[PDB]
Design a protein around this ligand. Structure first.
Ligand code: 068
Ligand code: CA
Ligand code: ZN
Ligand code: ZN
Length: 162
């Protein structure tokens, strides 16, 4: 399938959810990218001007991409695989209640799953995998990618360099 054709990839946060402060949204997103860069040769950097490779957007309902959101619950976010235009972009349903821990939908865990899609990964049947299709909370301090997630992403990008 299509894959990013460079190792240095930029992201930009288009707009912000009012559910968490700016520092907390930035940290969740940064840490989510870090989960994937830790096990591949990919490098991610945040930019604030210019066209980014990956745009992170919060939106609700119909928002211009033929994939309208559905209110609180159900689909929590979605993302586009590598390709032209919006390819790579990650959209989070603003009707969810985003949190730093577990009092609602954890942004970090959700961002890990969606960035997986943005990098080219599909769903897993392994219930311990972050790419499993269904959200579940796990202690952020105890969180680790499953072996399944690791094999999947390394099959697309290889493992870290010496
Ligand atoms: C086990 C673990 O750490 C874990 C992390 C994240 C998830 C996760 C799965 C799905 C979703 C949301 C799926 C979204 O509504 C639509 C999609 O992208 O498929 C968010 C988080 C599941 C397990
Ligand atoms: Ca929803
Ligand atoms: Zn969208
Ligand atoms: Zn998914």
């Amino acid at each position: 399938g299509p894959v990013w054709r460079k190792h240095y990839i930029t992201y930009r946060i288009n707009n912000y959810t009012p559910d968490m402060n700016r520092e907390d949204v930035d940290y969740a997103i940064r840490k989510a990218f870090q989960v994937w860069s830790n096990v591949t040769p990919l490098k991610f950097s945040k930019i604030n001007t210019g066209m980014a490779d990956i745009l992170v957007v919060f939106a609700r309902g119909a928002h211009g991409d033929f994939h309208a959101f559905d209110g609180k619950g159900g689909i929590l976010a979605h993302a586009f695989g590598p390709g032209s235009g919006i390819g790579g972009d990650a959209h989070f349903d603003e009707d969810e209640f985003w949190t730093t821990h577990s009092g609602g939908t954890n942004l970090f865990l959700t961002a890990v799953h969606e960035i997986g899609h943005s990098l080219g990964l599909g769903h897993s049947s392994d219930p311990k995998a972050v790419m499993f299709p269904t959200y579940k909370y796990v202690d952020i301090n105890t969180f680790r990618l499953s072996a399944d997630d690791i094999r999947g992403i390394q099959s697309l990008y290889g493992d870290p360099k010496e």
